[PDB]
């Protein structure tokens, strides 16, 4: 009849297939949630190993075929990009929402009503979180940042080492702090250059009060350390001058060839002399430096580094006050290098790190920067440390930007479930079932934590729900809103007092993204797969 | 192919030779900034133009 070249799935078949794919994706990463979660080994059939706990990384490395599973993977990636934390919780919540919504649909509830109920439940959950479950960080102080970093780094390779890594992360984030127009203190994470190097233990990871370059001097002749550095950042190569494409040298008088060839390098000689005549000590350029220019720097006792990365050069110039010069051309058509185009640093040292060397630009003036050197046991451990450290930095940035945090350990999810279950009776007649199922699906996070802890998930979640119900029914028991889970002892615990925090933005964005993904997948009721 | 839309929006007139590049060929705008979409890329926004 149709005569279309492909397969067709219609009705409950395609819906069940989509829910199966989402559930499989959720079960892939369900075992890596919460402090009692465990990492995963990923092998790419070539011999490369990626030990990771990040949900976004796991879903990115895996090659997936089903479109709904791809939707969940992109959801995790988007959560990672826009927040930096909660990449596993968003996927689990979205899959649970999809499963419960499909159960409702199989109960002959129209998907439009389910979608409307889900949207209303998401709005009410966000409003309730922003009205009741937020804790202002103004009165908490640096302890709030430390606790947020420790909570973020739990369930990672740097978990128990939180007492030290949280201080390190907070110091780095505060170091890279800057303010802009509209009076907003903006924290540009990814300005912290994360350098990995196996060797000593995690305790030997260093927080550089400056910047760290994964580069060395171009020649062994130059000194490896300069005290009062005058950093000169350049964006052009220092090589023998070559005529451009449109210029060709044609010789008719033999006497001029030697002069031509001499000036061919005298041009670069003069440029280097102009640069060095102002007292520059450290010269960083993105382009290459050949042997003759390297010797020019050697004789003057300078420090020349070639093939410096563009982002690294920009960060060094911004921190040290130097201006990146793509050319030595001024507004008078001349070749000049003013002294004001020089950066300043308190030291530039080429340190040795496990039979390898890197350049440390220490204590730059006019701006404070930061870099991190992660010391581990092998490359895989260093990569996992870097991923966890990036997660912690993102969490600290979120806490510092928006001054609201919420208790962790499933407390917010349980409170939301209780409130939405109570609220569903006040809206609609058929979408109330959708709101109730949204509330029930919100309970998948504490259940997953308890399951990962190998404790009595049913009884523990029942106790948590009872605590939150008592909090929401009795006006005088508002202090019970912070009751979460203590996974080590398997008992409910006041997480706000215990120091388990996370940014409100993480929960809000995860809820919104999961609701949108569930709505998107729920609309599909007929799939046509054309034959390639 | 975006020249026509840009000129209709801003009010500029294209210039192909530096000799004819004058102030009368410019398009005044209230604001022109490159906003950041919460890590999802950068959008270059020009909002507010005389003679829209």
């Amino acid at each position: 009849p149709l005569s279309v070249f492909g397969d067709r799935s219609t009705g409950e078949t395609i819906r069940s297939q989509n829910v199966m794919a989402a559930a499989s994706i959720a079960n892939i990463v369900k075992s890596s949630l919460g402090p009692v979660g465990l990492d995963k080994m990923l092998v790419d059939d070539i011999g490369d190993v990626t030990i990771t706990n990040d949900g976004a990384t796991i879903l990115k490395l895996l090659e997936v075929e089903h479109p709904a599973a791809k939707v969940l993977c992109e959801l995790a990636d988007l959560q990672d990009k826009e927040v930096g934390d909660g990449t596993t919780s968003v996927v689990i919540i979205a899959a649970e929402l999809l499963k419960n919504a499909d159960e409702l649909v199989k109960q002959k509830i129209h998907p439009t009503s389910v979608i409307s109920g889900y949207r209303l439940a998401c709005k009410e959950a966000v409003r309730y979180i922003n009205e009741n479950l937020i804790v202002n960080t103004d009165e908490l102080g640096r302890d709030c940042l430390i606790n947020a970093a420790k909570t973020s780094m739990s369930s990672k390779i740097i978990g128990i080492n939180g007492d030290f890594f949280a201080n390190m992360v907070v110091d780095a984030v505060l170091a890279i702090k800057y303010t802009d127009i509209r009076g907003q203190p903006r924290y540009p994470v990814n300005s912290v250059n994360i350098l990995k190097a196996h060797g000593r233990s995690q305790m030997e990871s260093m927080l550089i009060s400056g910047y760290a370059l994964n580069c060395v001097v171009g020649s062994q002749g130059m000194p490896k350390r300069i005290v009062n550095a005058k950093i000169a950042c350049l964006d052009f190569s220092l090589q023998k001058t070559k005529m451009k494409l449109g210029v060709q040298v044609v010789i008719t008088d033999p006497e001029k060839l030697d002069q031509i060839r001499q000036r061919e390098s005298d041009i670069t000689k003069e440029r280097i002399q102009k640069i060095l005549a102002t007292g520059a000590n450290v010269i960083l350029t993105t382009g290459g430096i050949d042997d003759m220019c390297l010797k020019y720097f050697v004789e003057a006792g300078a420090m020349a580094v070639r093939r410096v990365l563009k982002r690294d050069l920009k960060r060094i110039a911004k921190a040290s006050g130097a201006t990146i010069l793509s050319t030595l051309a001024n507004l008078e058509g001349e070749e000049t290098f003013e002294a004001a185009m020089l950066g300043q640093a308190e030291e530039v040292v080429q340190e040795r790190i496990c039979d390898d060397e890197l350049i440390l630009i220490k204590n730059t003036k006019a701006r404070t920067s930061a870099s991190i050197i992660l010391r581990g046991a092998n490359d895989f451990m260093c990569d996992e440390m870097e991923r966890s450290l990036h997660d912690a930095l993102c969490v600290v940035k979120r806490v510092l930007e928006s001054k609201s945090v919420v208790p962790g350990g499933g407390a917010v999810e349980a409170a939301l479930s209780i409130y939405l279950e109570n609220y569903a009776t006040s809206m609609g007649s058929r979408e109330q079932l959708a709101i109730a199922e949204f509330a029930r699906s919100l309970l998948v996070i504490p259940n997953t934590l308890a399951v990962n802890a190998a404790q009595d998930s049913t009884d523990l979640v029942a106790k948590l729900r009872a605590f939150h119900n008592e909090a929401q029914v009795n006006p005088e028991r508002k202090n019970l809103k912070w009751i979460g889970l203590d996974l080590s002892n398997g008992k409910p615990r006041d997480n706000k007092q215990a120091g388990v925090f996370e940014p409100t933005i993480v929960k809000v964005k995860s809820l919104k993204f999961a609701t949108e993904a569930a709505i998107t997948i729920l609309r599909i009721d007929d799939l046509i797969k054309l034959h390639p | 192919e975006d020249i026509e839309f840009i000129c209709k929006t801003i009010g500029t007139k294209p210039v192909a030779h530096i000799d004819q590049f004058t102030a009368d060929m410019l398009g005044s705008a209230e604001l022109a900034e490159e906003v950041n979409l919460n890590g999802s890329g950068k959008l270059l926004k020009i909002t507010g133009c005389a003679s829209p």
């Binding site: 005569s3 070249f5 070539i46 011999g47 990009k81 890279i176 800057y178 303010t179 802009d180 127009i181 903006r186 540009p188 994470v189 990814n190 300005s191 250059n193 994360i194 350098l195 990995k196 190097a197 196996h198 994964n214 060395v216 990365l309 982002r311 920009k314 960060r315 911004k318 921190a319 790190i353 496990c354 390898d356 890197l358 006019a366 701006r367 920067s369 490359d379 260093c382 990569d383 870097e386 990036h390 034959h531 390639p532 | 950041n36 890590g39 890329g41 950068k42």
Partner: protein, 205 residues
């Protein structure tokens, strides 16, 4: 026997589904046969000499890499071969290794390709069984050493029967020089790694 002008008419439009179903597999095989045509029978039938630098080059190659020696990728299927030769950038040279287990003159050039991959990160040395592709009897009897070189999606080096011009237990430098004879080779040590939105840095403003 009349009516030779059949004009099948309605027939095809009700059966083009099955016709295209067969045609897709026919074309899928067709890429494989057309690709293997350019090698299977295209050309099957047809004291400074001491190189003192060869020894120092071998010594430098012995210290190629620290982490691991790495192994040559083993292609497991024909369509895998097709979708790796067609994939990847056309500006890179991809070298394919043709061999069968047991034939002499193989392990030496396996080790040579291992050393080349260790030294050269750009090139994409890979190996695949001769029988997996499905070469003919003549290839399996007198064409085991085959050097398949890809560049731009098309062949630029098609060496076969290289034992006479290389030897039997040749070193890495020997095959490297042999490949360099036709200009086939395109022109620091980090700690472990460096690569860690787009917000980079600002200051006060």
């Amino acid at each position: 026997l009349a009516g030779e002008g059949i004009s099948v008419n309605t027939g095809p439009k009700g059966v083009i589904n099955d016709w295209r179903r067969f045609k897709q597999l026919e074309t899928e095989q067709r890429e494989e046969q057309c690709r293997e045509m350019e090698r299977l029978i295209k050309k099957l039938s047809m004291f400074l000499q001491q190189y003192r630098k060869q020894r120092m080059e071998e010594m430098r190659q012995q210290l190629h890499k620290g982490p691991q020696f790495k192994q040559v990728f083993e292609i497991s299927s024909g369509e895998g071969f097709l979708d790796m030769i067609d994939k990847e950038q056309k500006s890179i040279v991809i070298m394919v290794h043709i061999y069968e287990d047991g034939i002499p003159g193989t392990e030496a050039m396996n080790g040579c390709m291992i050393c080349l991959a260790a030294e050269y990160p750009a090139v994409k040395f890979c190996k695949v069984k001769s029988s997996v592709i499905g070469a003919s009897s003549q290839f399996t009897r007198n064409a085991l050493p085959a050097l398949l070189i890809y560049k731009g999606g098309e062949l630029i080096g098609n060496f076969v029967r290289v034992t006479d011009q290389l030897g039997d237990d040749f070193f890495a430098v020997d095959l490297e020089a042999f490949l360099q004879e036709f200009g086939l080779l395109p022109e620091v040590l980090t700690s472990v790694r460096n690569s860690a939105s787009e917000d980079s840095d600002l200051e006060i403003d």
